Amino acid sequence: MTLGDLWKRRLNNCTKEEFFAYRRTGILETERDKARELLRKGETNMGLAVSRGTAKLAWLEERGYVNLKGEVVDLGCGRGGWSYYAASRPAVMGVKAYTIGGKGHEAPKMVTSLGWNLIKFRAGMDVFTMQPHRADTVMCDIGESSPDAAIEGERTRKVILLMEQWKNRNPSASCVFKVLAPYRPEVIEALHRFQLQWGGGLVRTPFSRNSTHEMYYSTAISGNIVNSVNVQSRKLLARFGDQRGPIRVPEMDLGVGTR
């Protein structure tokens, strides 16, 4: 049993009020008041982020932890926050975005955010059985939360295997992907093998809530994986009891227009 396993158990044991306060203590949170209503009413001429994912990927790019370029593939695009971010980057020439959709899953939001015309969305697509194709940048933000850490570990393992398949097709592609449950043993083993062959490392974004252990793997960074995970598990375990609120910041606005 790992520190992350203990964190998950302590999380599940919170009362409702305890969980709510812990979830957001000390986290950066974009102000989505305007964006949320525009999307709800069906406004398409908007550059405000379609989800909280946009600011997360922007942070990784602005830190130099990812370098989005060329032909990008967004595996599990959901509402499209990462696809719209990538399409706005001058170094990106095209985005192919795929998501399963259906009951309980978010379909792409359709807006004129800058570079929208460079995105090809395909909903109703399972990426785990889809054959890889050529790409310069492979992104994947898949990892559905579950109160069961063993399920979260298996979900994470499937994402890492997907990334190995895309790297097999594209050995030189840059990769950025969510690692939902990085502390599980089969996840450590799989990440170690990934890092051995492809380089990379893990990083925690400041927008990720304390109710998730998610870390992002990128081929553009480095770092001992076990040390990265345990550092994160301890920061999460130490935040239990903190009463400070979230840190509110403006939502990303990418502007509108074609590229």
Ligand X SMILES: C[S@@+](CC[C@H](N)C(=O)[O-])C[C@H]1O[C@@H](n2cnc3c(N)ncnc32)[C@H](O)[C@@H]1O
Q: Which residues bind ligand X (CB under 6 A)?
A: 51, 53-54, 76-82, 98-100, 105-106, 125-128, 141-142
As given in the structure block, the two tokens for residue 16 are: 């409702």
Residues 125-154 that bind Mg ion (CB under 5 A): 145
Residue 211 is assigned to a ligand binding site: yes
State in angstroms the smallest separation of the CB of 239 from Mg ion. Answer: 16
**Helix/strand/coil for 258:** coil
**Type of residue numbered 140:** C
Question: In whole angstroms, how large is the CA radius of gyration of the chain?
Answer: 18
- Can you tell me the distance from the alpha carbon of 23 to that of 221, in angstroms, rounded to the nearest whole number? 27
Q: Return the SS3 of 157.
A: helix
| Residue 154 near ligand GTP by CB under 6 A | no
213 binds, among ligand GTP, Mg ion, ligand X, none (CB under 5 to 8 A by kind): none
DSSP 89-139: STTEEEEEEEE--STTSPPPP---BTTGGGEEEEES--GGGSPP---SEEE
Stretch that binds ligand GTP, among 39-47, 144-152, 230-238, 240-248 (CB under 6 A): 144-152
Least distance between Mg ion and beta carbon 183 (Å):
13
Of the candidate spans 12-20, 59-67, 156-164, 244-252, the one that interacts with ligand GTP by CB under 6 A turns out to be: 12-20
CA distance 181 to 146: 10
Asked whether 233 and 7 are in contact (CB, 8 A), the reply is: yes
Does 112 contact Mg ion by CB under 5 A? Answer: no
Options 2, 67, 112, 146; binder of ligand GTP; rule CB under 6 A: 146
Q: Which is nearer to ligand X, 21 or 159 (CB)?
A: 159
Cα–Cα dist 10/82, whole Å: 31
- Residue 141 binds which entry of ligand GTP, ligand X, Mg ion, none, CB below 5-8 Å type-dependent: ligand X
What is the rounded CA–CA span in Å between residue 162 and residue 142?
10
Residues forming the annotated binding site for GTP?
Answer: 8, 11-12, 14, 16, 19, 23, 145, 209, 211
Residues engaged in binding Mg ion (CB under 5 A): 145, 212
Residues forming the annotated binding site?
Answer: 8, 11-12, 14, 16, 19, 23, 51, 81-82, 105-106, 126-127, 145, 209, 211
